[PDB]
């Protein structure tokens, strides 16, 4: 299979404005939201039909309780960081946990935290350590590293549990996640500012979002600057992107094991 990932995010906001919740937690399988929880709904809900159809009420019932607990723990952790930093007003606290199952069968695992959207603590499952970005993070790291059982638990979660959940969700969403929708690629030539010809290579209607696009002069990569367009969601479950140059040129597209050449 291709590279797939499972990730869960937590967002905590102290003193939030009207509307905005105090806590949001959302899960993703690749680019696909799979689950959601916030401090307003107070319920874990599916964000994909294949999640809703395959996971029994007891999964959602149990996880809602865990999230109600995690919500509370986040509110307290943010109050302690603000105390530490001597910060008043509204501030954010974030977490990202997750794992990847690579094509070759190997795995990656990660657990990170941010304060005000900047890196705070990064977990090293290989040395059972926390990388602190500053003196406040260092106080947390010292506290966190004292429980060796918690560190070991986390290494097992990232390596074994996370991978098992990913494989499980990959099967549920098989028809969405494992499908391939090839791109429709066109080349557009234009004489822009007098004497300046811009060649655009536009790709659309593709799934998965990972595509590789490049320009070539005679069969060697254009040492001139290539302007790359972002991979954008089209809104129908497919993605779009582009790549441009200024001037024998050819556009090269590689998507899901198929290479495509568009000569000019």
């Amino acid at each position: 299979m291709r590279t797939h990932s499972l990730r869960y995010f937590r967002l905590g906001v102290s003193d939030p404005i009207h509307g905005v919740p105090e806590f949001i937690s959302v899960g993703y399988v690749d680019s696909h939201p799979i689950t959601t929880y916030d401090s307003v709904t107070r319920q874990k809900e599916p964000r994909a039909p294949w999640m809703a159809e395959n996971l029994a009420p007891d999964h959602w019932e149990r996880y809602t309780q865990l999230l109600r607990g995690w919500q509370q723990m986040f509110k307290v952790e943010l109050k302690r960081l603000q105390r530490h930093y001597n910060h008043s007003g509204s501030h954010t606290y974030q977490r990202m946990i997750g794992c990847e199952l690579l094509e070759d069968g190997s795995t990656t695992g990660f657990l990170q935290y941010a304060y005000d959207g900047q890196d705070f603590l990064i977990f090293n499952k290989d040395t059972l350590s926390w990388l602190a970005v500053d003196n406040v993070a260092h106080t947390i790291k010292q506290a966190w590293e004292a429980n060796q059982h918690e560190l070991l638990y986390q290494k097992n979660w990232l390596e074994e549990e996370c991978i098992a959940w990913l494989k499980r969700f990959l099967e549920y969403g098989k028809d969405t996640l494992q499908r391939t929708e090839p791109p429709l690629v066109r080349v557009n030539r234009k004489e822009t500012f007098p004497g300046v010809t811009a060649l655009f290579c536009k790709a659309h209607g593709f799934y998965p979002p990972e595509i590789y696009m490049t320009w070539m002069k005679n069969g060697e990569e254009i040492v001139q600057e290539i302007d790359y367009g972002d991979i954008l969601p089209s809104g129908d479950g497919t993605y779009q992107a582009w790549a441009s140059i200024e001037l024998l040129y050819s556009c090269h597209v590689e998507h899901s094991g198929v290479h495509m050449v568009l000569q000019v």
Partner: antibody
Amino acid sequence: QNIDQPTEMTATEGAIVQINCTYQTSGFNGLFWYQQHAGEAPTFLSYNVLDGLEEKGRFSSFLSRSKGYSYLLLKELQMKDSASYLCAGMDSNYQLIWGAGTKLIIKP
Amino acid sequence: GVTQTPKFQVLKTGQSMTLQCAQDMNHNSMYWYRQDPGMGLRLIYYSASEGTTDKGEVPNGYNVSRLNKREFSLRLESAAPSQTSVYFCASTLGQEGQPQHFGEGSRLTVLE
């Protein structure tokens, strides 16, 4: 789903006893061992989540995640070690599955 | 640690009964179990955090109150002889496998 440990075990004072525990859980977040003396509350003994043997005095706990088993080893047995030993395993949903216990009898 | 009351109690079938539990360890999660012969601890109800509770394996004939962060009561609506058991209250710091701390236990006997 299922945690299995012997109902009872009898060993001789001064000797070693290994209380086995096999788990068949839907996911795994760690294995616990608790000691419960007759008519008393259970108290935490050990926790294992990764493969290996963890020693805490005369007591040691081992885990084999591939083999799906654990053991609680008691060395230099004393009459005081006569209690029920409770095995508990945690689910992929952070739920504890409690074993029925093992009554350990020490023959003086 | 965990403080539960009473250690012993005799009840006539149909009587109401409240079991109190308090922890002063700043633990978040709290549990009510029943210990019966030949079986592992059966969870009645749990409270993952202050402000939430949920049913366990055996919730019928029981209800609970997470009064505050410290306290977790267990009520027997109408005592039945099947409810003759030993009840344990437990508390955990977190939910991710922090060790459980047990109350002294409460032996309840329900008689016609």
